[PDB]
Amino acid sequence: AKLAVIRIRGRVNVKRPVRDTLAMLRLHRVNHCVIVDDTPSYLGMLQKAKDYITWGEINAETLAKLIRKRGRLIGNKPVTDEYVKEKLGMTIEEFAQKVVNGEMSLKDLPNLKPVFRLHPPRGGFRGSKKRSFKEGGALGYRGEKINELIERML
Amino acid sequence: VQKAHSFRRKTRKKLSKHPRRRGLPPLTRFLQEFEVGQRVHIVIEPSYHKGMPDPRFHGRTGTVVGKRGEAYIVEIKDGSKVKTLFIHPVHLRPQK
RNA sequence: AUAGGAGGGUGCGGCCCGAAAGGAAUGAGCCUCCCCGAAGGAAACCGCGGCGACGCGGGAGUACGAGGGGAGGGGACCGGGGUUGCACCGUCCGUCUUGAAACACGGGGCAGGGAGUUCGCGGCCGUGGCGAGGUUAAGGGGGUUAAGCCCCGUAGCCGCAGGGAAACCGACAUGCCCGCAGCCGGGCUUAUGCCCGGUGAGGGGCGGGGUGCGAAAGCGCCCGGAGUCACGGCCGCGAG
RNA sequence: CAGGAUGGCCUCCCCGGAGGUAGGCGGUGGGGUAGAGCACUGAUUGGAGGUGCAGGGGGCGAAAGCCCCCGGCCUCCUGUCAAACUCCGAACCCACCGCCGCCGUAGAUGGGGGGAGUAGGGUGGCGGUGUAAGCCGUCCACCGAGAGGGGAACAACCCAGACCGGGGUUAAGGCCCCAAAGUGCCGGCUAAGUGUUACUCCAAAGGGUGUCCCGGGCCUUAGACAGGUCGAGGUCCGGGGCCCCGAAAAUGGACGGGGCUCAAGCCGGCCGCCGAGACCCCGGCGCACGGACCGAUUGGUCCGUGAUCGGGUAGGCGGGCGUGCCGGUGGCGUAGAAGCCGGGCC
RNA sequence: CUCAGGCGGGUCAGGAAUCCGCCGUAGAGUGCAAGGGCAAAAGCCGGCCUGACUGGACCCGUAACAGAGGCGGGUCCAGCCCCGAAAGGGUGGCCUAGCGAACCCCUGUGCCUCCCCGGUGGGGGCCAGGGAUGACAGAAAAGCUACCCUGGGGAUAACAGAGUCGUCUCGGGCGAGAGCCCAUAUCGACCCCGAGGCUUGCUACCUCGCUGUCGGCUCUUCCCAUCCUGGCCCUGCAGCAGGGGCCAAGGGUGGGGGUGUUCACCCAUUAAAGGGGAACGUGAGCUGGGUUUAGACCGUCGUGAGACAGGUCGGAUGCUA
RNA sequence: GGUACGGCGGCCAUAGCGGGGGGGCCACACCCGGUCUCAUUUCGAACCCGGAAGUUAAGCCCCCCAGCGAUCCCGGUUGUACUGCCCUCCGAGAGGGGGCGGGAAGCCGGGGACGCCGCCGGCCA
């Protein structure tokens, strides 16, 4: 399963282990998203940094929309259907379907940056950034509901 | 009051044996053998007072780089320095 | 002459100046119309969900949108400056200190003056000359208005062999391995490039050797040629 | 001991050439803290049984010793402990190995050289100490050395780390007025202006048929309680929420102020808005690295990457502006030099 | 070979002399503190010995990470030896304390060396051991200052402010009781919970390129935990009075003796002659009696200079807003 | 290949302490006697030497147990005590709480457990 992880809290008052975990996850700034696997190592990293991020399962439609809108290449060039077809031979929707199914990975698309720099959500986060999602905040694991947040952040 | 470090400073429990393990240990650890490049843990046997390394290194894992007399030469990484110890095989345990 | 904050900051308004050096009659502020457009982004109205604030689908990614272009009208300002008003913000400068607006110290105004300099020794770097050699010192001759310029000057100093308190003894111009760059052969790749295998200066490690201590083994230092001079800079020590 | 030296932490240059480990997963080992417990060592209430056991008190006997009480010593039951106790024992930390992730041939790990500054720290959590304030360490988060948006102002608390000109959306938090955004919605509580306080500031023991509820017993709709008569719920207890009493200070005055009572307070939830230099987008600058092309002494033009460049005290490094004089080179000036006063442009 | 302690049995012999048996995980011992380790031993009893030796190498600790003179420790090579049948062990004490640079001097040993050369006496050098610096990473070493001076320090005391409230002042909870019965008219043990900043102490946060002290006089203002005046409640309140408590800060709360005194004591009156805050209010308003310089005396301490939070006499108070 | 035989060992109590029953082809013992080897701080008690008259009483070998000690598993106490990270959650304070990740000790009940394994030899076949 593919997990989308978005950084929530800022870069101040962060201790060294959590800061280095976030740097290894490539979440250097707020409103930044990455796609990883549900392997035990990644799960342990998410557990270590759970107080500053929110993660969940992402479906193929949301992944395709994210790639089309906020995906970028080296040099911050936009990702287009023509480029995707020329490099891989299929549409962005099919590429996202296969990535979610596990038959390929984002790295299969050449010169694709692994970080999506999202926009602040429409209507804002619907919870305090000091509590967890289960309590009503905006931190920690939220499951399938991460798709709604990604939709609000493009 | 500052107290300088000595060989037996604060070793009341570290260098104490289980009541049911009092006495001479089994001879397998005494007669065990190692090869160059093997990694070994350091578990000091309190009853044997010969070839004992500093208790500060008790519990660490080192690598065997030679053998002088009856004692093995063990290399450890204390911070960034390489430290060489001459440890009797009774104080050593193979890794895995 | 009814208004409060270290005397300022952002924006604009009122009054006033506005020849030159800024733009401008080859057209200013200004007025009207058309095209494209990033991130973002409504609503009238219709249908539905909720006790409610309200929300969801269509309208619609539409109207609008930083900015980028075009056309028409008019005919002298715009930029800039002095003062002041309004809205919001703003407790001076230097200094020791964990901590300065401080009821902690130095602070009436202006003009001039004012604080890492020189030598000797040493470490290092940037560059240049010569090179198993490098370099002159004091001084001498030629020439010159002149102290500038030209030539000579091997005494001396460092280096070429180190070890030892001393007596004293006295070493690889490459025997072997690993190996970066470069070179050579091959494979893939549009190309760059990557990989495999050799050779590999410099680099690293063995082996061997000189000497000191030792009865010896064995250890310390040294051994397969790069040093020397000059200009400039940083620093250490002694001189105020 | 207001001072120095060697290290640690910063910066600049060079050699060398393929590994490195701040985070995670699994494994191989180490530990005796928290908690707990009496199995050692030392404490600790009462009872029962055994032991004359060198004890004491009486009665009792010439003398050999008895009878009880108490005391001591063991076992069991009962009720309690330990920073200098442990038959047990976490969370967690450390060493090593494999892997994921990240960094590295645009040169890391590492090595050599040059220059420093620093030897008063503070707040915050934890530990020892103290009535407390405080003192002494530890953790490296924030101030020191840190802008902007808030807590009324605040070093430390929350958001947030910042090149320049613009557009948009969010963060802390807020929406009765001051003051941008609701006199917003559903259910309940408070009658004390309690409260209107995330933290830097906030009063207790003991009480309240003051109110709103939960649970458990006795009688229990003309068989209950109050005063054999009436004729519907009473009797008690243990709890939960808000509030009340306990509650006295000195210039006049503090929820920031006004003020606020089916709130503009509290409790359990929700809806929509407003709000930063944060995040997104367009344009510009510089920097780091790599590339092409071009300079008769350090360089110059242009392209490529930067989510992984842009705060800054001590300090290190690079470039540039200004002043007097000398060797050259090219010039200006009585048709007006230097200097001075007010303006325009870069 | 097995200890400490205990039990049972034994001539004097008993609590305790010596002896037999059994239980006995160390409850003994190991030179000396404590911790750790030791049971066919590291303990006890015997035999034989001097490895508590000579010439050297590497490594760990003091001093983690992360630099080190000196010192301590560990693993080994060689020589000469000791014990043992042999394996094996021996570089002091089962491990962790009992100790020390330069210069100089003394001793051991066998080499080098002293200015043209050689001999002798003497000197210098290399290696090893020793004499100590306890302020123990190594000066040789008594005090006063009130006649004091300089550079500084709120890195640091006294006065005052700030934090705290142990202490101080003032309350509260329960009720053993004392009150002829009756806990609550009144007092209220032993315990427990607080308020104030009005006593003192603690900290050292602001102030040492100066914020002028105590007391008194003058003057203004504030708090209530109320002494009198106004109004009430309980009473072990007959009246006159008392004891306890509540509301209430408009007004009053005075004059004198000794003492520098605040305070406390005393006197005669009075309705009463309240306690406190305002930089312990008020010295650019006063006075200067005390304290706290420079002079001097007494007592005590010191060899002395001298000192005393011990007395005693004298000892300056700046101003044009 | 069999053996209620022995020697040398590994883990070092789930293996120990204490009880009940059975056995000796061989083998192991108890046992008989001290000239020689060896010894008593006396003692042939131990150790040693020379043996097989007697015994399986016990050391030993085989089977069993759960009184003590130890220790493995399951259920309850219990996700209790304790604890890592974050927090604009409550509390006058002491302290507690929410989310994610770990998790005892002791006690009660029911089972387990009176050891497992390696090399070789003796006797018989």
mmCIF file of N, CA, C and O (backbone and C1' of nucleotides) in Angstrom, chain A residues 9 15 47 50-52 130-132 134-135, chain F residues 84-89 97-101:
data_model
loop_
_atom_site.group_PDB
_atom_site.id
_atom_site.type_symbol
_atom_site.label_atom_id
_atom_site.label_comp_id
_atom_site.label_asym_id
_atom_site.label_seq_id
_atom_site.Cartn_x
_atom_site.Cartn_y
_atom_site.Cartn_z
ATOM 1 N N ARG A 9 3.480 20.742 11.104
ATOM 2 C CA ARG A 9 4.076 21.721 11.999
ATOM 3 C C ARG A 9 5.376 22.273 11.421
ATOM 4 O O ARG A 9 5.968 21.708 10.499
ATOM 5 N N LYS A 15 13.281 18.922 17.950
ATOM 6 C CA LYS A 15 14.479 18.290 18.473
ATOM 7 C C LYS A 15 15.228 17.556 17.365
ATOM 8 O O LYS A 15 14.692 17.292 16.285
ATOM 9 N N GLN A 47 6.043 6.654 12.984
ATOM 10 C CA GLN A 47 5.784 6.641 14.420
ATOM 11 C C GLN A 47 6.733 7.577 15.157
ATOM 12 O O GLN A 47 6.335 8.255 16.112
ATOM 13 N N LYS A 50 5.497 11.211 14.344
ATOM 14 C CA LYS A 50 4.042 11.304 14.263
ATOM 15 C C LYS A 50 3.490 12.629 14.771
ATOM 16 O O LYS A 50 2.345 12.968 14.452
ATOM 17 N N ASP A 51 4.257 13.379 15.553
ATOM 18 C CA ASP A 51 3.733 14.589 16.176
ATOM 19 C C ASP A 51 3.815 15.815 15.278
ATOM 20 O O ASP A 51 3.381 16.892 15.697
ATOM 21 N N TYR A 52 4.357 15.688 14.066
ATOM 22 C CA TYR A 52 4.520 16.821 13.170
ATOM 23 C C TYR A 52 4.018 16.554 11.758
ATOM 24 O O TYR A 52 4.165 17.422 10.891
ATOM 25 N N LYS A 130 -2.219 20.946 17.337
ATOM 26 C CA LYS A 130 -1.633 20.463 18.575
ATOM 27 C C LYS A 130 -2.232 19.146 19.049
ATOM 28 O O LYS A 130 -1.648 18.501 19.925
ATOM 29 N N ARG A 131 -3.369 18.736 18.501
ATOM 30 C CA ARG A 131 -4.007 17.471 18.828
ATOM 31 C C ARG A 131 -3.894 16.515 17.648
ATOM 32 O O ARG A 131 -3.489 16.891 16.547
ATOM 33 N N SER A 132 -4.264 15.264 17.892
ATOM 34 C CA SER A 132 -4.267 14.251 16.848
ATOM 35 C C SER A 132 -5.605 14.244 16.118
ATOM 36 O O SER A 132 -6.600 14.804 16.584
ATOM 37 N N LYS A 134 -7.639 11.783 15.609
ATOM 38 C CA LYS A 134 -8.673 11.046 16.326
ATOM 39 C C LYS A 134 -9.364 11.925 17.361
ATOM 40 O O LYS A 134 -10.587 11.861 17.524
ATOM 41 N N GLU A 135 -8.596 12.754 18.069
ATOM 42 C CA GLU A 135 -9.172 13.682 19.036
ATOM 43 C C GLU A 135 -9.899 14.847 18.380
ATOM 44 O O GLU A 135 -10.640 15.555 19.067
ATOM 45 P P G F 84 9.028 8.399 30.915
ATOM 46 O "O5'" G F 84 9.248 7.999 29.389
ATOM 47 C "C5'" G F 84 10.544 7.714 28.883
ATOM 48 C "C4'" G F 84 10.529 7.600 27.379
ATOM 49 C "C3'" G F 84 9.941 8.792 26.638
ATOM 50 O "O3'" G F 84 10.885 9.829 26.432
ATOM 51 C "C1'" G F 84 8.943 6.809 25.841
ATOM 52 P P C F 85 10.444 11.366 26.567
ATOM 53 O "O5'" C F 85 9.578 11.633 25.259
ATOM 54 C "C5'" C F 85 10.179 11.625 23.974
ATOM 55 C "C4'" C F 85 9.152 11.820 22.890
ATOM 56 C "C3'" C F 85 8.261 13.043 23.031
ATOM 57 O "O3'" C F 85 8.878 14.233 22.575
ATOM 58 C "C1'" C F 85 6.933 11.155 22.535
ATOM 59 P P C F 86 8.549 15.631 23.289
ATOM 60 O "O5'" C F 86 7.101 16.011 22.745
ATOM 61 C "C5'" C F 86 6.890 16.301 21.372
ATOM 62 C "C4'" C F 86 5.424 16.425 21.048
ATOM 63 C "C3'" C F 86 4.637 17.432 21.869
ATOM 64 O "O3'" C F 86 4.806 18.767 21.430
ATOM 65 C "C1'" C F 86 3.427 15.410 21.738
ATOM 66 P P C F 87 4.675 19.979 22.476
ATOM 67 O "O5'" C F 87 3.129 19.991 22.864
ATOM 68 C "C5'" C F 87 2.133 20.253 21.888
ATOM 69 C "C4'" C F 87 0.743 20.025 22.429
ATOM 70 C "C3'" C F 87 0.342 20.875 23.621
ATOM 71 O "O3'" C F 87 -0.070 22.174 23.237
ATOM 72 C "C1'" C F 87 -0.318 18.621 23.973
ATOM 73 P P U F 88 0.655 23.472 23.839
ATOM 74 O "O5'" U F 88 -0.545 24.329 24.435
ATOM 75 C "C5'" U F 88 -1.331 23.829 25.510
ATOM 76 C "C4'" U F 88 -2.787 24.199 25.365
ATOM 77 C "C3'" U F 88 -3.469 23.693 24.096
ATOM 78 O "O3'" U F 88 -4.814 23.324 24.390
ATOM 79 C "C1'" U F 88 -3.612 26.055 24.192
ATOM 80 P P C F 89 -5.274 21.797 24.211
ATOM 81 O "O5'" C F 89 -5.705 21.347 25.673
ATOM 82 C "C5'" C F 89 -6.862 21.884 26.290
ATOM 83 C "C4'" C F 89 -7.440 20.925 27.298
ATOM 84 C "C3'" C F 89 -7.362 21.360 28.751
ATOM 85 O "O3'" C F 89 -8.386 22.269 29.109
ATOM 86 C "C1'" C F 89 -6.643 19.120 28.563
ATOM 87 P P G F 97 -3.869 9.585 35.271
ATOM 88 O "O5'" G F 97 -4.583 10.496 34.176
ATOM 89 C "C5'" G F 97 -5.984 10.723 34.211
ATOM 90 C "C4'" G F 97 -6.419 11.687 33.135
ATOM 91 C "C3'" G F 97 -6.216 11.225 31.701
ATOM 92 O "O3'" G F 97 -7.249 10.364 31.255
ATOM 93 C "C1'" G F 97 -5.436 13.446 31.938
ATOM 94 P P G F 98 -6.970 9.296 30.090
ATOM 95 O "O5'" G F 98 -6.918 10.175 28.764
ATOM 96 C "C5'" G F 98 -8.086 10.791 28.241
ATOM 97 C "C4'" G F 98 -7.798 11.463 26.925
ATOM 98 C "C3'" G F 98 -7.024 10.626 25.920
ATOM 99 O "O3'" G F 98 -7.867 9.760 25.180
ATOM 100 C "C1'" G F 98 -6.038 12.771 26.090
ATOM 101 P P G F 99 -7.355 8.305 24.735
ATOM 102 O "O5'" G F 99 -6.411 8.598 23.488
ATOM 103 C "C5'" G F 99 -6.923 9.208 22.313
ATOM 104 C "C4'" G F 99 -5.817 9.560 21.352
ATOM 105 C "C3'" G F 99 -4.795 8.467 21.095
ATOM 106 O "O3'" G F 99 -5.239 7.526 20.133
ATOM 107 C "C1'" G F 99 -3.678 10.505 21.525
ATOM 108 P P C F 100 -4.958 5.959 20.339
ATOM 109 O "O5'" C F 100 -3.446 5.779 19.879
ATOM 110 C "C5'" C F 100 -3.073 5.994 18.527
ATOM 111 C "C4'" C F 100 -1.576 6.043 18.356
ATOM 112 C "C3'" C F 100 -0.796 4.863 18.909
ATOM 113 O "O3'" C F 100 -0.830 3.721 18.073
ATOM 114 C "C1'" C F 100 0.260 6.864 19.557
ATOM 115 P P G F 101 -0.770 2.253 18.721
ATOM 116 O "O5'" G F 101 0.696 2.160 19.336
ATOM 117 C "C5'" G F 101 1.834 2.217 18.490
ATOM 118 C "C4'" G F 101 3.128 2.243 19.265
ATOM 119 C "C3'" G F 101 3.396 1.070 20.187
ATOM 120 O "O3'" G F 101 3.802 -0.096 19.496
ATOM 121 C "C1'" G F 101 4.008 3.087 21.260
#
